[PDB]
Write a protein that binds this ligand. Structure first.
Ligand SMILES: [Zn+2]
Ligand SMILES: [Zn+2]
Ligand SMILES: [Zn+2]
Ligand SMILES: [Zn+2]
Lengths: 398, 395
């Protein structure tokens, strides 16, 4: 009965001191190890240059945490020497302040062509086999094509083959973000009451992540009530809570860029039989997916394990509704969604240090949905939860 | 400093009722005009198929406001029939709630190849000359190339040829967002006091944008005091004698405001006054240069000629203007056309851009004044009137 409702704003505020179990930042040597692993995968693929654009992969490789813009900010890695950092001249100051890796800077004034610098740096090292970051804007392919006549490969296999398996230091940053968001989830369930707005919960979760010391409040937040829980990614519009509705809250933060991403679905007031039944089936499907995880297991096998529970209960098969209309889970790291994907058709074997969500949501069309989301990482012999799963329809927190 | 300081938090709150002059949303017919306009651009350039990714361009053509993810959500426009909307099958309900244009849905299940669906819709209409959104992830080039033997061209000319010139309805939405954000700016100036935190200003700017009825509070907020104003891409507490620089904005129906004010709290030095005045003059001269037919790069040069005649610069040297003068603005904070040296693009009626020829004095301070304008048949019109003096940030 006790986790849902009855907590005031300022009672909740009393649990929101800055978080004091702070994981260490990624250190210099770890950035060099990332570069070295990228070089190994480059040579494996027969490529001799890699271009990484601003975003999660530039951060991974260099520390630079800036979002992509219309101006090319990029790392060009070749098989030897400090990687080249292509960046607007006016930003040099700022760049030097966030860089965690020694680089050769190649700066361009506003009217200069930054893609000519990439190719000039290629030509300097006799590199003629470029792989380009699949996350980068298409525009960069156009700019490179004005100067570069050889095939441009997709760098996805190189990037994933680095980022998929998390180091201990990555796992602890993730763990920190997750503990923080779990606390936030718990307090939002506490402050809930008849008539509370979805927007009031969203603003609260944001204030709470901030108080705790997230990099930037809530990375995202989804709050849905009642029938609106039937849409995996929700519909526009504010709702107000009523007894008898499910509440689905999916939110997360970052800590040094590393993401949490947790969904809780709980009853406010008394559940129907149908709500209970679906809610227990969801917990069961999530548990079977977790139980399937260890080294060597194909990513699709984990998704299949979830569907097997649904299907033994008369749901599915496949994506059929009522059932699980989307994949079981996604990888998580510096990006909310990254490889590997726990999806039908993905033969990728799971390996120690891989991180993914386990969120086999059930949708009952016309009625509601239940999504329980906790992330795990693969160990040497099985998996570990970052956050323990829910206990019951009215006990969202183990 | 009647504009700067002296206002209580609840005095400020009395001017924060919801905005009553609400611009009309973009209606169904105007989405159809954008699709036609794209079709004609396509024909002009010899392109028969156009793929637009999730993001501001999808929003422009379809009303779908979602950010891009790892899953392909896209609009494929060909020379005839309803456009095709490629989408994950499970998000169909959520898609239907935001779509503003009639489309032929082509849904894909989690394990199916959505790039296959694009090419199949191409093959059906006999379209072989595809142009791809330059803002879409390169991954999409990869998935398309897997299925295509033919050139995949860059769609920037087509997309820009539509988006750069704003309709009356788009200008009205931008206008509302600007008017709302100007008020927020002025209230933030009013509540400023010795000791106030940059974080408290940020928080208040958000609350106000929400109270006035922005889509989602502040889109972004930069607040910098004193020496920090010299580091435009760097928590502080306000002290007498410091410049305050606040750059913020909101959206109304996804249309952006983006305004920077820089003002003195207390008594300014001669150096601060002289640079402030020069910032206003540079901004004024870039504006006086705006009219149809003028190259975007001439507007940037008009600001730099002001700075050079005063002994700053030249070019991008400091003290001076180390970056372009401004950027286009619309459904994206930054979009074409850019007011930057090398850009020959002629300005035309309806185009919207910022005018922000920030001066940096290394290691001391910076002064950015940012107001946006749109191009008219004979010149330009400010979305917001420029500042008046170092201590009079609002006209
Ligand atoms: Zn989630
Ligand atoms: Zn997730
Ligand atoms: Zn701005
Ligand atoms: Zn701007």
């Amino acid at each position: 009965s006790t986790q849902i409702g009855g907590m005031s704003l300022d009672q909740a505020r009393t649990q929101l001191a800055p978080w004091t179990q702070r994981a260490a930042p990624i250190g210099a040597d770890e950035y060099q190890q990332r570069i070295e692993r990228a070089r190994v995968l480059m040579r494996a693929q027969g490529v001799d240059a890699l271009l990484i654009g601003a975003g999660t992969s530039l951060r991974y490789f260099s520390g630079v945490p800036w979002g992509a813009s219309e101006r090319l900010v990029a790392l060009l890695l070749t098989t030897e020497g400090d990687p080249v950092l292509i960046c607007p001249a006016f930003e040099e100051g700022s760049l030097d302040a966030v860089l965690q890796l020694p680089v050769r800077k190649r700066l361009w004034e506003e009217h200069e062509d930054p893609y000519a610098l990439v190719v000039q740096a290629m030509d300097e090292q006799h590199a003629h086999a470029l792989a380009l970051d699949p996350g980068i804007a298409f525009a960069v392919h156009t700019g490179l094509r004005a100067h570069l006549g050889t095939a441009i490969r997709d760098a996805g296999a190189i990037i994933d083959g680095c980022r998929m398996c998390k180091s201990p230091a990555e796992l602890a940053l993730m763990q920190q973000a997750c503990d923080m968001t779990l606390l936030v989830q718990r307090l939002a369930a506490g402050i809930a009451h008849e008539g509370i707005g979805t927007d009031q919960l969203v603003r609260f979760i944001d204030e709470a992540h901030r108080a705790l010391g997230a990099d930037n409040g809530s990375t995202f937040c989804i709050v849905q009530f009642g029938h609106a829980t039937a849409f995996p990614h929700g519909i526009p519009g504010v709702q107000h809570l009523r007894a008898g509705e499910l509440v689905l809250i999916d939110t997360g933060c970052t800590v040094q860029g590393y993401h949490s991403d947790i969904t809780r679905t709980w009853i406010y007031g008394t559940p129907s039989d149908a709500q209970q039944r679906i809610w227990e089936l969801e917990l069961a499907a999530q548990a079977a997916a977790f139980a399937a995880v260890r080294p060597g297991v194909a990513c699709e096998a984990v998704d299949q394990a979830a569907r097997a529970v649904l299907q033994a209960a008369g749901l599915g098969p496949d994506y059929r509704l009522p059932g699980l209309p989307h994949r079981t889970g996604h990888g998580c790291g510096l990006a909310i969604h990254e490889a590997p994907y726990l999806v039908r058709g993905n033969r990728q074997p799971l390996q120690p240090g891989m991180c993914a969500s386990n969120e086999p949501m059930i949708v009952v069309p016309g009625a509601f949905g239940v999504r329980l989301e906790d992330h795990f990482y693969v160990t040497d012999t099985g998996a570990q939860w970052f956050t323990p799963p829910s206990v019951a329809i009215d006990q969202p927190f183990a």
